[PDB]
Known about the structure:
The structure is a homodimer.
Chain A: E1 4-8, H1 12-16, E2 23-29, E3 39-44, E4 47-49, E5 53-54, E6 67-72, H2 75-80, E7 84-89, E8 97-101, E9 112-116, E10 127-137, E11 142-147, E12 156-158, E13 162-163, E14 169-178, H3 179-182, E15 188-194, E16 202-206
A molecule of 7 linked components (NAG-NAG-BMA-MAN-NAG-MAN-NAG) binds next to strand 1 and strand 2 of chain A.
Protein name (chain A): Immunoglobulin heavy constant gamma 1
Subunit structure (chain A): Immunoglobulins are composed of two identical heavy chains and two identical light chains; disulfide-linked. Interacts with FCGR1A; this interaction mediates IgG effector functions on monocytes. Interacts with FCGR2A and FCGR3A.
GO biological process, one term (chain A): complement-dependent cytotoxicity
Amino acid sequence: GGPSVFLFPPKPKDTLMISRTPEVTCVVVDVSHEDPEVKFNWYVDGVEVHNAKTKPREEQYNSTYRVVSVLTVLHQDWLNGKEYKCKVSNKALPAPIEKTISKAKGQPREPQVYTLPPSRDELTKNQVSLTCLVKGFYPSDIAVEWESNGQPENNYKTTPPVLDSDGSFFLYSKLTVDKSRWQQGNVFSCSVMHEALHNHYTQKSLSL
Amino acid sequence: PSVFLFPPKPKDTLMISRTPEVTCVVVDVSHEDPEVKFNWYVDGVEVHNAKTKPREEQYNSTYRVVSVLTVLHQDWLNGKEYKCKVSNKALPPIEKTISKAKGQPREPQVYTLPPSRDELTKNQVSLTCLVKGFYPSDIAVEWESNGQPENNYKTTPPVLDSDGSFFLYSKLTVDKSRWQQGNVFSCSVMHEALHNHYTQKSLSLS
Ligand SMILES: *[C@@H]1O[C@H](CO)[C@@H](O[C@@H]2O[C@H](CO)[C@@H](O[C@@H]3O[C@H](CO[C@H]4O[C@H](CO)[C@@H](O)[C@H](O)[C@@H]4O[C@@H]4O[C@H](CO)[C@@H](O[C@@H]5O[C@H](CO[C@]6(C(=O)O)C[C@H](O)[C@@H](NC(C)=O)[C@H]([C@H](O)[C@H](O)CO)O6)[C@H](O)[C@H](O)[C@H]5O)[C@H](O)[C@H]4NC(C)=O)[C@@H](O)[C@H](O[C@H]4O[C@H](CO)[C@@H](O)[C@H](O)[C@@H]4O[C@@H]4O[C@H](CO)[C@@H](O)[C@H](O)[C@H]4NC(C)=O)[C@@H]3O)[C@H](O)[C@H]2NC(C)=O)[C@H](O)[C@H]1NC(C)=O
Ligand SMILES: *[C@@H]1O[C@H](CO)[C@@H](O[C@@H]2O[C@H](CO)[C@@H](O[C@@H]3O[C@H](CO[C@H]4O[C@H](CO)[C@@H](O)[C@H](O)[C@@H]4O[C@@H]4O[C@H](CO)[C@@H](O)[C@H](O)[C@H]4NC(C)=O)[C@@H](O)[C@H](O[C@H]4O[C@H](CO)[C@@H](O)[C@H](O)[C@@H]4O[C@@H]4O[C@H](CO)[C@@H](O)[C@H](O)[C@H]4NC(C)=O)[C@@H]3O)[C@H](O)[C@H]2NC(C)=O)[C@H](O)[C@H]1NC(C)=O
């Protein structure tokens, strides 16, 4: 026994557009089996609020339960670097655990987006890789997706943000397409959403 | 008390000059029983040559006991299991076993990619090394130029690919001036599936 608490930041895509709802999430896992009750206390910059909503206590799986408390947040507050403390109270837990999270406190830097064609070596394979390099951005809260002429593409993966040498972050997004589709005239785009970008959105095309 | 067992660093396993080490970490111990005895087992056989690190502590009620066992390079690549038996007096012993990923060994595919034409306006460009479809995750990636090693590069964490293999990217940063004078940069990769545990891919200007 002995429950652990994990606190999660709001999704970046949700941060960017006021049309979406950004949510900070406190997740309690591995809880007791005779105490199906936990109390959440949220604080914004040291001031308690009651915006929150606790999830039902389900299920285990393996043993125990996971309780999830979701407090949604204001778009501006997160970006302003407001602190969010999630005090989890359990009664099978000396002593109640507090977790704090916020935006990275530093100088915001706009990402440089570079689309990169498949290696001439990779041509021999049936599937080729379209690589989108995004570098020199801060903070790491960023969203990377791929699109085609009219519909978005999938089966692509994006690397975790990596701290660069100059103190900034970069990552890679690798889109996998059939080589037959590449040697045609198809146009692929790498769309990037970040707070430091103007209109919190940029896009780069990659064609043959 | 909870028991956590950690695998060696891939750079230490793939390099004969380094010492790969499995690490056993005990957390949530008391100041009523501040003493732990470790028992290490290689394929069911006990060994005695480990090393105990002294407690820290961890600034709570608890301490944090760490036992470290040096691992043979061939044993770890051959897939031998290492078990860390923790005995405490507030324990009705907890056993943790660890080894190399027991999956299908896949040879890495290495592709060097030139700077985007967009990046050329800048003073520093990016040389990119794509390494894909390798298994396990245990890999080592470094850059060299003209025979000498580069230092201004970063490598992403291995990423789990959709076909169950892994991939990562290694970004070398050079002055644009070096790139345009036709200097030749090579991307070095160390992995078990590779012949001689090594491959090399060069990237130059045209
Ligand atoms: C009281 O306080 C304490 C202290 O805070 C609390 O402790 C915490 O307890 C919790 C849980 O109770 C622990 O959680 C678990 O954490 C691990 C991952 O952790 C690590 O990163 C943490 C970062 O947050 C870090 O803090 C922590 O210390 C770990 O860090 C790693 O440490 C190792 C060991 O040293 C490093 O590796 C080794 O590295 C060295 C090199 O390192 C350096 C150095 O700096 O020292 C580098 C130097 O460069 C080098 N110097 C030189 C000259 O070379 C030196 C040098 O080597 C010498 O040291 C110096 O001479 O070394 C070597 O390379 C070694 O060879 C190498 O072995 C490593 O680098 C380092 N990493 C980092 C990033 O720092 C998780 O794995 C756990 O996850 C599992 O369990 C959960 C449930 O129990 C699951 O939900 C979860 O899914 C997960 O499951 C498991 O999944 C896997 C598959 O993925 C399965 O295989 C497994 O079976 C499965 N388990 C299951 C199902 O049960 C978990 O999150 C936490 O670690 C601990 N925190 C700390 C800090 O100790 C405590 O809780 C408190 N009490 C309370 C609250 O009551
Ligand atoms: C009983 O059964 C239970 C259910 O299986 C089981 O619960 C599990 O317990 C482990 C912890 O031991 C916990 O692991 C953490 O997982 C985090 C990611 O979880 C995401 O993703 C997982 C899948 O990967 C999902 O299962 C989760 O539900 C959750 O999903 C996300 O949820 C949100 C909201 O719903 C969505 O918006 C997301 O889209 C969605 N994402 C995905 C992919 O689905 C992971 O972040 C945790 O990692 C960090 O904390 C650890 C603390 O030890 C560190 O070890 C670790 O290094 C990470 O550290 C951070 O690293 C950063 C960068 O390095 C630093 O900047 C941070 O500072 C640092 N954090 C700090 C301060 O510590 C962690 O691995 C599982 O999530 C949890 N599973 C579930 C379903 O809840 C129990 O363990 C079982 N008990 C027993 C006894 O067996």
